[PDB]
Symmetry: D3
Subunit: 260 residues, 6 copies
């Protein structure tokens, strides 16, 4: 059952192509410190680069929890908010990020959940925002992007009233993808991933970047461009342009197929 | 049961922190004239300023109706369309606006419903657009913003076919938040409001402005900025900047915590 | 049962105000070649102009299929991708375009389905994207616009896992408008259309352009502008502006009603 | 020569179709207060309604000054934003006539107005970061869509002062004239606008807002779209059939492609 | 020197990779009609398909004129918009060669084209609000994203005429040359473009549109993305496995971060 | 005079609040590599954290050069984009000090930085379409929001070189000075910024990004919004009530309209 790489507050493991970032703080119910986030960013950064991995999954250690948010009940000392760096990271990574929620995903923990491409929910799961009850709020991806899933009314609902939502309430609003019994959530998530690795990783990275460019204006278009520049690089045409530079002569795009 | 402030075609009342704007034209089934809208704008403007109120609710007088739209079956005389001024107002107000629909919310009446942050629906409620049957249309918030709740297909549906939608059909598409029996709709709405007043009014005003900035481009960002400028005003740093102006000397932002 | 206009791979028919574009390639399960698309574009272009038609419907020949996508199992010879020209066309046409799916709507076939204003689904229908399984993807309207119906999570789902979705799964996510037994799908769609032709065609063209301007930034606003310029043209004010040009004298917008 | 309806902290005037809103606080370099803004909101709203008003001009009292922001010396929350928002929902063109210092929330007002005519002694710039505020709304984003991001980021970061000619070359102001001719020119501009159709004008205005204000600017464009729709015979007959309790017949009205 | 395929109201020519669309109605100052636009839509679509065409130029017949809008003298609905839309979905650079009056829907056409080379006798401006129309689409919003909102609001509100140098300083045109050298320069521009890669060009073009056209401009960017994807070995093998009725093996193809 | 923490392919320095990132590869005209970019990402991230750093300057080693893109001579995927993205999420103003050739992905870097101060010998332009790449992200769209679409489409299509004064008139650079005074001026700019409040600065920076970066730029604006919220007494008391296991009392804290 999956290998492992050295971390203090998180777990970074691997199963047959899947990378698994796990929040390993069940005592505090998987709440993150600045160090925790910094470890997650590092873990994802390595997951992005490793050619062996095709799909990433984010989850909590045991049952009962996925993530809680902050706490203080950081290191540096400096009031960091690197939580937001991670938010951006998982959705620029040209690999699907799946949230395997197996309990409470509340506050900051839920925002990490919504920013993940897909969500596998255990029947045990409870979703919600706690910000305005705990003197906080995620007004970025936690608000705008949430509306882009559930509809404005529901997003307005979960932030204002701050209620809890069971797996079925989450499924019924479209927040989560499937709900499976707690025992089966370690499976199913793998079945999902196994289903992705059948498909072209390059087609998936474009579609991910296309979905980001839908919402993130000119920051999302950057990702689309970078994947384009990457594919364009691999074309015989581009080779000619950089060969002519090393050959100090003029480029000859004379005989190359021009598509209407 | 709630106090009151002087109005001719609407009712402006108050219950334990809640302000209640009521369309008082049940004879014409709560349709608005230019005067009605002008009263509603005034009522909301006062609701925005009054430090005693935390949540606003919009509703119709008795049962059977929430709102119908226009009529002519205005004052000035001048063909006003101030209906749109109100639309903008309720969503710049740093207080949640809840639509307590207790019957027909059709035509212009439904657009007022959708622009309200949350919607409490009585089982009695019927929703729809009548524009293209009555030689009209709301192509602004009535179209674009509607899609941002129900999905484009459903928004396209309700405008083209102009069908009626019962409380459950409304709930199933995500248009409304909850459906409660007609007898209980005066409650529940209060329970909702009572639940908001537990949370930080400042966190809520930012989240509201964040949800507007999601859709309203640079007009929504203005609201976000204004709330920022408001909170920045309250910080010791800002005080120093305006003190130095009244003291005619140079500002000293030397010893103030700089966050990464 | 409906007349007809000359085409090789598609059918262009007419019923009491409804135009019916039919993909006539059931042998290949209604997959399109470049010629097929070019015929569809022509058909729609004629449907746009013909004052007799009020609503357009897109569908496949027999049962079992709506559309499959590409194939090669074009003419010119030139690798065309005119599929995208059609995508833009049906949503600039000032007439509702209804997708009458009576079977498989997969791959490119589903994208044509989602771009259609409304969708009438037969119980027989199966929806899905096959791109990353067949070395392709629609990262434009197939990704972004899809999220604007079903929510990001579901759009992310159907592209990454590439699963099939039955009529009810489609209805439950909001992708399709209604589901009716296969026998009744030729009706119902007509009932829908008959319901549109009761309403003002001009109010509908604005609302369509308003829904496009919601998502398509400055390309959608063009459509809104063009409909505006069209209605403004019909006003006595505009007449005066162009009369003064033909009369070589100065325009007199002196006595014309100015609305606040 | 100019007809008046008075206030306490502003001046409100009419001249041959032109309505002129004037800040009347030169001693404090024409700075606004909560109250001064409230008066402007009112005067603009009245100008919105007046059928004889076709163009609105915002100006300072004498020379030397136009607007130097909000002074705070007279819990203060911020209705300048409502005014900015208002003065671009007015279906009437509004021209900024700057004849001195236009700084802080005084400059953002200049920016928000459709066009700016500047007397040669004009001074443009921000104070925000030095005085304990900022205009992160139209003061920042919208300024970039006039001046360009590189230059818009400049004015906010350095808070320097810019003379009339510098404003012209970056693109902040439309025109620059001598101080003596600035009461004129503006009237010429107004005279030139008033001979074009107010409806086409109000639409283009909405089209410019919709380009940037997203869905809120769309409401403006659509709002003026439905007004034109009201005036058509296929619209009124839709409303008449409802009044007469019968099915509407749009059937015989010219279609368009 | 220039090879021709003819029409009734336009001229369509080829020269060493350069295709030239020319309005052929100088008597009415090169104004378009429904028919004239239809011809341009066709000629552009043919230019879209021609593998030997790398750059497109839009110009007027002689000097004096380029385009003065739609005359209406020959129910008229408005296909100019389809043409505007078309001439920015062409994966080929299109340069406006203006040698006289470019006004009304004639100026918006100039605006829509990627670049504008101007002969020194060029005159730019709008007529809309005076003649009973407006271009609230690319005529308004897109013009602001070239000229800046302050100046874009100017040209529509006042409907004044602007000489070549004024257009240059606000940023409307790329370059200004003497009338004699305007047939040249444009060819030089074309010659310069034709030596760069057409694929990188078509992408940047789509990136510029996507920046402003929202989701529609995204379709363009993505559309060119999937074309490049078609030409890769991991794409064709995906399509081949479908044809051969077996499971696709993308497994051994280089990954990227 | 300047204090150093070293790397292999860059230089990283501090001077009275100013941190200076310098590409240290003049032999290849200051071109970056995957590694050189990684170093810059690190150095910027360190500058992000340093409480004593208020302004960041990006520059080339000597004169003649600033950045000429990515050379590729030393599967290469493209972390320059991460750096571009990073250097606009830094709540600190970053100024491009260009003293030579700024071309290709070297020019886009210049563009991404908030402001550009240019030595008179500066040369700006793109190489993409000729060398087998393009910057369809901030290189294209964002460049238009500085220069204007007409001119932004020019630089990419023709790939010409532009001197310092030409960059100034189109609006690419903020200021132009003699080469000798470019180490100065930049420091003056920095000195001028460092006397304004860092919080108002970081907000305006986020407001400028949010204007263009859509929902991602919104995250930045909101992120700085919640930081200010943390420092308020009604926020901490919300967090304290959670720690103390009791119901929060926001009830007695001043409200705003
Ligand atoms: C900048 C930042 O850092 C903040 C952010 O922006 S992110 C948003 C902040 N979010 C929050 O504070 C969420 C509040 N937490 C909750 O609501 C939790 O669900 C809650 C404690 C009720 C836990 O629910 P639960 O299942 O009933 O667990 P419960 O029985 O209450 O408590 C178990 C332990 O979890 C800890 N815990 C759970 N969530 C926590 C959190 N977010 N912070 C700190 N501790 C937390 C509790 O303190 C408790 O620890 P102890 O045994 O030492 O007292
Ligand atoms: C610019 C503008 O002003 C217009 C706009 O943009 S807003 C859009 C305009 N909307 C409309 O016109 C909606 C049309 N109204 C409806 O469909 C109503 O539901 C409708 C009259 C059927 C009422 O439904 P109902 O429950 O069956 O009530 P019903 O039995 O029909 O009639 C009861 C009374 O309500 C009145 N009424 C209801 N809605 C009305 C409306 N919108 N305008 C005028 N009168 C209305 C009816 O005229 C009737 O009055 P009388 O007794 O004097 O004849
Ligand atoms: C640029 C482009 O052109 C491509 C694009 O961008 S659009 C996206 C491309 N999409 C696809 O390729 C979709 C793949 N097709 C499918 O998945 C089909 O549903 C699929 C063949 C399984 C058909 O499902 P089905 O109901 O079981 O039909 P099935 O029994 O498998 O086969 C029946 C016939 O349909 C044909 N067919 C169905 N879809 C086809 C397609 N997309 N292309 C070619 N042939 C297709 C099969 O080849 C078969 O023909 P034969 O009898 O000559 O072998």
């Amino acid at each position: 059952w999956e290998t492992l790489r050295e971390y203090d507050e998180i777990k970074y493991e691997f199963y047959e192509g899947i990378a698994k970032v796990t929040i390993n703080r069940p005592e505090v119910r998987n709440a993150f410190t600045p160090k925790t986030v910094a470890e997650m960013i590092d873990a994802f950064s390595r997951a992005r680069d490793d050619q062996n991995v095709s799909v990433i999954v984010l989850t909590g250690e045991g049952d009962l929890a996925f993530c809680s948010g902050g706490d203080q009940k950081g290191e540096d000392q400096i009031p960091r908010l690197n939580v937001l760096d991670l938010q951006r990271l998982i959705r620029i990574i040209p690999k699907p990020v799946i949230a395997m929620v197996k309990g409470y995903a509340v506050g900051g923990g839920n925002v990490l959940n919504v920013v993940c491409d897909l969500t596998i929910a255990a029947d045990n799961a409870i979703f919600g925002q706690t910000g305005p009850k705990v003197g906080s709020f995620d007004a970025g991806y936690g608000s705008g992007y949430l509306a882009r899933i559930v509809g404005h009314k529901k997003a307005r609902e979960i932030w204002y009233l701050c209620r809890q939502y069971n797996a079925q309430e989450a499924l019924d609003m479209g927040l989560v993808n499937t709900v499976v019994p707690l025992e089966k959530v370690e499976d199913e998530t793998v079945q999902w991933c196994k289903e992705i690795m059948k498909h072209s990783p390059t087609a998936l990275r474009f579609l991910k970047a296309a979905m980001n460019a839908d919402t993130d204006g000119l920051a999302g278009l950057q990702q689309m461009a970078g994947d384009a520049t990457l594919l364009y690089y691999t074309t015989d045409e581009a080779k000619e342009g950089r060969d002519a530079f090393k050959e100090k002569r003029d480029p000859d795009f004379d005989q190359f197929p021009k598509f209407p």
